[PDB]
Design a protein around this ligand. Sequence first.
Ligand SMILES: NC(=O)C1=CN([C@@H]2O[C@H](COP(=O)(O)OP(=O)(O)OC[C@H]3O[C@@H](n4cnc5c(N)ncnc54)[C@H](OP(=O)(O)O)[C@@H]3O)[C@@H](O)[C@H]2O)C=CC1
Ligand SMILES: NC(=O)C1=CN([C@@H]2O[C@H](COP(=O)(O)OP(=O)(O)OC[C@H]3O[C@@H](n4cnc5c(N)ncnc54)[C@H](OP(=O)(O)O)[C@@H]3O)[C@@H](O)[C@H]2O)C=CC1
Ligand code: NA
Lengths: 285, 286
Amino acid sequence: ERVTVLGLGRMGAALAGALLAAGHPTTVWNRSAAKAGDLVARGAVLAGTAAEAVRASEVVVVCVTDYDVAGDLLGPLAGELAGRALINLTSGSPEQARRSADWAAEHGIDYLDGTIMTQPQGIGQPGSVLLLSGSAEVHSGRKALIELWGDGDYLGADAGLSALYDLALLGVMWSTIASFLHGAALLGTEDVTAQQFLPKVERWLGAVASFLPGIAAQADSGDYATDHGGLDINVAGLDLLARVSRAQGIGTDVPAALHELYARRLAQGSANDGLASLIDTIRRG
Amino acid sequence: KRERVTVLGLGRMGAALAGALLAAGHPTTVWNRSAAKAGDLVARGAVLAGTAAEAVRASEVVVVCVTDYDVAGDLLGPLAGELAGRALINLTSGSPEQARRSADWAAEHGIDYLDGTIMTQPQGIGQPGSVLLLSGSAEVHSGRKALIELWGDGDYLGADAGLSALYDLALLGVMWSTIASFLHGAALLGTEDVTAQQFLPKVERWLGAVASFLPGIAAQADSGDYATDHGGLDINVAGLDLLARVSRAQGIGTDVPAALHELYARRLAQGSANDGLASLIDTIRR
Ligand SMILES: NC(=O)C1=CN([C@@H]2O[C@H](COP(=O)(O)OP(=O)(O)OC[C@H]3O[C@@H](n4cnc5c(N)ncnc54)[C@H](OP(=O)(O)O)[C@@H]3O)[C@@H](O)[C@H]2O)C=CC1
Ligand SMILES: NC(=O)C1=CN([C@@H]2O[C@H](COP(=O)(O)OP(=O)(O)OC[C@H]3O[C@@H](n4cnc5c(N)ncnc54)[C@H](OP(=O)(O)O)[C@@H]3O)[C@@H](O)[C@H]2O)C=CC1
Ligand code: NA
């Protein structure tokens, strides 16, 4: 099926490359035409203008720096985009994606927002994941196409969901990485490398990952059992982590922030509340 | 051979240790400062000794599990004479320094000493996959491997007795972090009526992808060479700011993203735009 890709930066080039290696007829457009050279070699058709590109296909994928750019670029092509399917894999906020979808509704444009959770060299590779939201009709119908980039997880019809889920997952990434590097910092004061530390974390993360189904259940039922010792002892642990961190000779930022946060849930509840009770603390802005 | 073991201290964790010993056929002698705690284990065939000294003399390996190293020291100091010649395994939780203190005392009296740290709850003693960190006497570890393997999965870390506690705390840091952040995400998604149980599969998958980033981050962390093409510190700081702001927009707290934003952005403010996330380690060191 004939498909168009607007934006040929590192990620947009990767999205088109994968459509092409599966033998889709791939029309492309980029502001800097130079970047479509390798792709047009392997057999893409480069439009002269964006309008031109849009007219070439019933599916349009867009991947550019941000939604202000997307807006500036698609707004003029609203008339040309009527009746076509639009898949926006630009990264931005829930609100921007919702606005896009609104915009797309009034101009009779089927609209699927997505957020890519891998690097360009990871497109078409196993373990690539794209979160998707907006038009279900666009998702099924183009599911084959989407699956060339990775596992496509359709989340629902609110086009904001992809961005929202993404940012929640990114939160876990940033958190996990900082805590890794704090662990490596600390064991470093004892001549253990990050790479000798690494296998233990790999093992330990498996155990942690087994903990979360129970944490999730409780967070939802609101019944906070004490399967990790209860807040009292985990708060004391964090404190001891912070104190031992200083003692060995590094900073205490990571433990400090976590201490403050778990400690707070100790106030609004009991000593024998599980960690799961911490959701309740975050819900109150 | 299922040789005779003593357990001193029979709170929930100490009692769980003793029960696994009994359940692998070890003749188990127990002591607690209050006798009735030993009720269920004596019905299961533990021998409850009259005193700590009697307990210590029954067995050639002594396991102690009490609330802290202060109580441990108050208990074991008088038994120095009695413990001399025997193996002592200390699964009390505490600091690296407390464990190094206990090791140095133990060496003074010729007490072979292994310090450990249990990384599960009582309920998970005797389950494989429950993790134990052991540090101290290589002799005791290999000589009583079969014993330690009753309680779960033994990770022997080296000769320094404080290592078990050091790693425990580092790894616990990672569990606290992942739980904090996962519930932050759960609460964020709850503003659109998505439950934590719906979110969980998406996290469990992403966790796999996150684990696969660490080898590379580990390598950079060790080398000092933070320059990246993927995981640009600058764009990640903006990612974090974006997450904080979407958080108050959807109408929850921001304490988790904000605390991280601060830390990463502090490194961006004194490193290089070119840096990758591994560079954080330089900032945590100061
Ligand atoms: N790369 C990654 O690892 C990831 C990327 N993303 C998202 O993918 C999107 C694109 O990223 P990436 O390809 O790496 O970035 P690049 O900077 O490599 O490319 C950005 C694209 O935007 C275009 N563009 C920029 N400004 C304008 C403008 N004013 N008018 C029209 N087009 C414009 C560029 O055209 P030109 O070449 O002429 O500048 C280029 O095609 C972003 O939303 C990013 O967050 C999502 C997940 C991770
Ligand atoms: N349980 C958990 O979730 C986890 C536990 N740990 C660590 O394991 C350790 C063992 O905890 P656990 O034994 O189950 O806890 P408890 O506090 O329930 O029991 C403490 C033990 O020490 C004795 N004791 C307490 N205070 C004194 C005192 N002042 N003088 C003399 N003896 C005293 C108690 O006797 P009595 O029964 O008479 O009070 C009991 O034998 C802790 O340090 C904990 O941090 C590690 C991982 C997780
Ligand atoms: Na210990």
